[PDB]
Design a protein around this ligand. Structure first.
Ligand SMILES: CC(C)=CCN1Cc2cc(Cl)cc3[nH]c(=S)n(c23)C[C@@H]1C
Lengths: 558, 427
């Protein structure tokens, strides 16, 4: 029958009128078959006949399905659907397992065809009328119309899941001891009642739902021991993602390169190490999903190293509001960093990583933060609290970044714990020019039209030099010109830059970059005792910078 | 209670749907701080529970408006506003008192509790839909709609405007000298009487409001002999530019004269009146960044002539009412914040430096968020509108902790500039 629930007012878009999707005359062998299944739905009262004053129509196709020992009905109103108002989002948000607390038993119930138990606005049913012919050329319209939430119509999923949450309102009051969570047409119930005692309630609810059409034949609640949902696998005290099968073969194309870098990432929720720099790096191949990609030596290193991990599987534990969430972050790769959250001594709750795709020159202390940050942003979202942080870094290191970094960053709870690559500052510039030191009035340009210019510099002591560098462009030259000033110079040198980019990059005390032009400066700044970058603009009447500007004319006349 | 009334039929702008922003996820201490509120709020009849048919949304946050007092709601009405009161900026536009800025002392009161009466057309309620969340998208959240006057909305003081002009009549009679701008949900009242007297006139108004229409002011103080909430005693009559001063280094070391010549030239854009030539000439000559260099006599004149020209300001101090104003803040050092409200580059209508030393409660995502409201009140007073910000902060860090420290009632629109400084020097 139909669950008598307070109906909710669905409407069509303003100015718009219901469907007229007429249909190409159906299969007689399946047209009668429309009557031999509809009549059941009609006597079940879900389908009622009319014919004269309601013009609207839609498509009633018919088909068969999985292990069908019977013929099936089909009428997707994706026409009417777009001519149907917009509803509340079904559900954006997935109860990611790790957040879940342990309830002693949790059945899962099929919510059958609970769509038809619920009804449809007595007005919005006119726009649901469909049509069935009889013989290629015989009977005059056998028109039916819907009374209950049809099976494909923008609103059902919501009007539906609204209704149910109403239908489970009393029971959820009287039972403030047994959690429920709908899922499309499923219901996870989960008390702390011991097996059977739990069986008492599923049975009560089952009967409750039985009153207003929510027939739940999930006998004593059919509940497969493990849980695949959303690709998860849920157990009474553990969750995961079991079937992650990183394929192995020869032609590794963009399409599969992606897929390979999908599972891999997915796996990271629980697998304490899964790296994905390399494979993702090359993965930036555009338009050629079908075209093969040469899995590079390092992208190979990653692929199976992970396999090593991904064979030895992992069990994820459930949340328990007795303890503060704890956070450990350690850097594994290069751009790569990792974090796993626990509150108890050592069986995992959650795991994840943070890889930099900032642009081209990000610092390392900064880089801890962004990771840290991501976790707060994630814990807030799941557990509604904030991991106390534990991070490989003296405050001596941290506090020196904010007292001197421009953008600001805020750091919640965090305790230091010694581990391997200790997060720190390798080189630190000065404030005042180092006294007496050889002042390098550097420069290095190159022609736009001719990628080849010449880095070089000029010291206080008439000490010039220059280096012809091909395949260059101003940018790659004002840095190159710094490096050189960093080579023929003492252990305590001052430097004058024409550029900004250059003074930008170095001034931010960055460490790793993937190129040797920048990188080499870093390792020169590191081994050193007292650099001093400084900027005065080009051709700014700065004769001091003028010479550096005219110096290079021994490789271009102008 | 049962005391209904006429509805100013409210509507949208041309061709637009309602706000459909999505509810940012908030804490546990908070998801409850709102369930209670909102749940008081249904008994009270202000808000109602809704169904699917309504698919709009507006973020609801939660804060503690008095030195961390009691939980209070804070709908981010930033998107339904544009989607209504911009066409309503014209229909019921509460006029801006350009003399308020001049009053030697100002005070701000929360007349927002008042709107709480006027019912809203059930043809518009649809759009104030709001949503309170759950910890891990487990519970589908509680969905409410507004039945009175969405108190966050830029079109509510506008509706409940007449009712205010009225409740404010005798105050204006008695004291026809105090200004009263009614922006959003606050009333800036400006007097020009003895430090303590301005406060006097205010307890008065906080009281005349009271007895009359149940509109309630807020108990700024009692006997409370503690150093909490010094007071919102603004004084909009002060705002001048000068600490963009050149360090006068009688030890003109080259390095010194270098940076100096440096700054000086950027000024050429902000102050078309700059001619740093014969000064540059002094640095012409690869030399040690630690020596002296103060020659070109005529250049020295350039040092005074500029040092003094920095006092006679730009053309761009012209407000163009069809130009949204931009505020840019800058971590200048430890505590010292800075900002400059402009509309067209270098033509800046206002500058200043927000000061609150670290060590105390240095949360950078505090001194700024605080410095985002000050700067933003500084504009209700003046230009009568809030500036879109450029925030020296990671989108996220800010989206995480703004709502803690936000004690305010409105929310300026913003943007975080991962883009560095040239300006973060001494300015
Ligand atoms: C994740 C989904 C669909 C949950 C629905 N569902 C069942 C479930 C299943 C396991 Cl293995 C642990 C669980 N822990 C909690 S709390 N729940 C839970 C309750 C909700 C009511």
């Amino acid at each position: 029958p139909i669950s008598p629930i307070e109906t909710v007012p669905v409407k069509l878009k303003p100015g718009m009128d219901g469907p007229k999707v007429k249909q190409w005359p159906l299969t007689e062998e399946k047209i009668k078959a429309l009557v031999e299944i509809c009549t059941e739905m009609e006597k079940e009262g879900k389908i009622s006949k009319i014919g004269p004053e309601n013009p609207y129509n839609t498509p009633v196709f018919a088909i068969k399905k999985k292990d069908s020992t019977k013929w099936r009905k089909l009428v997707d109103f994706r026409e009417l659907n777009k001519r149907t108002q917009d509803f509340w989002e079904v559900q954006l948000g997935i109860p990611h397992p790790a957040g879940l607390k342990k309830k002693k038993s949790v059945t899962v119930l099929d919510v059958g065809d609970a769509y038809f138990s619920v009804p449809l606005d007595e007005d919005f049913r006119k726009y649901t009328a469909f049509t069935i012919p009889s013989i290629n050329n015989e009977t005059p319209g056998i028109r039916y119309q819907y009374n209950v939430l049809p099976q494909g119509w923008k609103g059902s999923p919501a009007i539906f899941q609204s209704s149910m949450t109403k239908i489970l309102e009393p029971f959820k009051k009287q039972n403030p001891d047994i959690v429920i969570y709908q899922y499309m047409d499923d219901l996870y119930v989960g008390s702390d009642l011991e097996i059977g005692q739990h069986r008492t309630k599923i049975e009560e609810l089952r009967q409750h739902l039985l009153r207003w059409g929510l027939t739940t034949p999930d006998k004593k609640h059919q509940k497969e021991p493990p849980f695949l949902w959303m690709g998860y696998e849920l157990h009474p005290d553990k969750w995961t993602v079991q079937p992650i099968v990183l394929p192995e073969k020869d032609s590794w194309t963009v399409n599969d390169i992606q897929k390979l870098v999908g599972k891999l990432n997915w796996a990271s929720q629980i697998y304490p190490g899964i790296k994905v720099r390399q494979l993702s790096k090359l993965l930036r191949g555009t338009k050629a999903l079908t075209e093969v990609i040469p899995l590079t030596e390092e992208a190979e290193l990653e692929l199976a190293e992970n396999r090593e991990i991904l064979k030895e599987p992992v069990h994820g534990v459930y949340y328990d509001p007795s303890k503060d969430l704890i956070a450990e972050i350690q850097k594994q790769g290069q751009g790569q960093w990792t974090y796993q959250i626990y509150q108890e001594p050592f069986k995992n709750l959650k795991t994840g990583k943070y890889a930099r795709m900032r642009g081209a020159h990000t610092n390392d202390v900064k880089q801890l933060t962004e990771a840290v940050q991501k976790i707060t942003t994630e814990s807030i979202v799941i557990w509604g609290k904030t991991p106390k942080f534990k991070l490989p870094i003296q405050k001596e290191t941290w506090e020196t970044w904010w007292t001197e970094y421009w953008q600001a960053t805020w750091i919640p709870e965090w305790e230091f714990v010694n581990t391997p690559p200790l997060v720190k500052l390798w080189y630190q510039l000065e404030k005042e020019p180092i006294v007496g030191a050889e002042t390098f009035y550097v420069d290095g340009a190159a022609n736009r039209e001719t990628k080849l210019g010449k880095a070089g510099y000029v010291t206080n002591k008439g000490r010039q030099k220059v280096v012809p560098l091909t395949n260059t462009t101003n940018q790659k030259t004002e840095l190159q010109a710094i490096y050189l000033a960093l080579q023929d110079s003492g252990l305590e040198v001052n430097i004058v830059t024409d550029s900004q980019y250059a003074l930008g990059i170095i001034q931010a005390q960055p460490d790793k970059s993937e190129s040797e032009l920048v990188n080499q400066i870093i390792e020169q700044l590191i081994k050193k005792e007292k650099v001093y970058l400084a900027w005065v603009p080009a051709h700014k009447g700065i004769g001091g910078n003028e010479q550096v500007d005219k110096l290079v004319s021994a490789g271009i006349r102008k | 209670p049962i005391s209904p009334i006429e509805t100013v039929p409210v509507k949208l702008k041309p061709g637009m749907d309602g706000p459909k922003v999505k509810q940012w996820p908030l804490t546990e201490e908070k998801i409850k701080a709102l369930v209670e509120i909102c749940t008081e709020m249904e008994k009270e009849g202000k808000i109602s529970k809704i169904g699917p048919e309504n698919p709009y949304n507006t973020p609801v946050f939660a804060i503690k408006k008095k030195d961390s007092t009691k939980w209070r709601k804070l709908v981010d009405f930033r998107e339904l506003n544009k989607r209504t009161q911009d066409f309503w900026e014209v229909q019921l536009g509460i006029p801006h008192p350009a003399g308020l800025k001049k009053k030697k002392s100002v005070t701000v009161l929360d007349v927002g509790d008042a709107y709480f009466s006027v019912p809203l057309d059930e043809d518009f309620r649809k759009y104030t839909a709001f949503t309170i969340p759950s910890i891990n998208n487990e519970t589908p959240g509680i969905r409410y709609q507004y039945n009175v006057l969405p108190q966050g909305w830029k079109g509510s003081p506008a509706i409940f405007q007449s009712s205010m002009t009225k409740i404010l009549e005798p105050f204006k009679k008695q004291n026809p000298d105090i200004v009263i701008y009614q922006y959003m949900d606050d009333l800036y009242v400006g007097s020009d009487l003895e430090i303590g007297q301005h406060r006097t006139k205010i307890e008065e108004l906080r009281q005349h409001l009271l007895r009359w229409g149940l509109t309630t002011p807020d108990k700024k103080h009692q006997k409370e002999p503690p150093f909490l909430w010094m007071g919102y005693e603004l004084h909009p009559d002060k705002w001048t530019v000068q600490p963009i001063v050149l360090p006068e280094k009688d030890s003109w070391t080259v390095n010194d004269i270098q940076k100096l010549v440096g700054k000086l030239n950027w000024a050429s854009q902000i102050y078309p009146g700059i001619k740093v030539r014969q000064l540059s000439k002094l640095l012409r000559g690869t030399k040690a960044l630690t020596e002296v260099i103060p020659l070109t006599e005529e250049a020295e004149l350039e040092l005074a002539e500029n040092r003094e020209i920095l006092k006679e300001p730009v053309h761009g101090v012209y407000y163009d009412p069809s130009k949204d104003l931009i505020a840019e803040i800058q971590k200048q050092g430890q505590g010292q914040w800075t900002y400059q409200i402009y509309q067209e580059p270098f033509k800046n209508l206002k500058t200043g430096k927000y000061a609150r030393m670290r060590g105390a409660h240095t949360n950078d995502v505090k001194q700024l968020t605080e410095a985002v409201q000050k700067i933003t009140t500084e504009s209700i007073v003046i230009w009568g509108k809030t500036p879109k910000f450029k925030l020296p902060i990671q989108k996220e860090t800010w989206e995480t902790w703004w709502t803690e420290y936000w004690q305010a009632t409105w929310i300026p629109e913003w943007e975080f500039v991962n883009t560095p400084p040239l300006v973060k020097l001494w300015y």
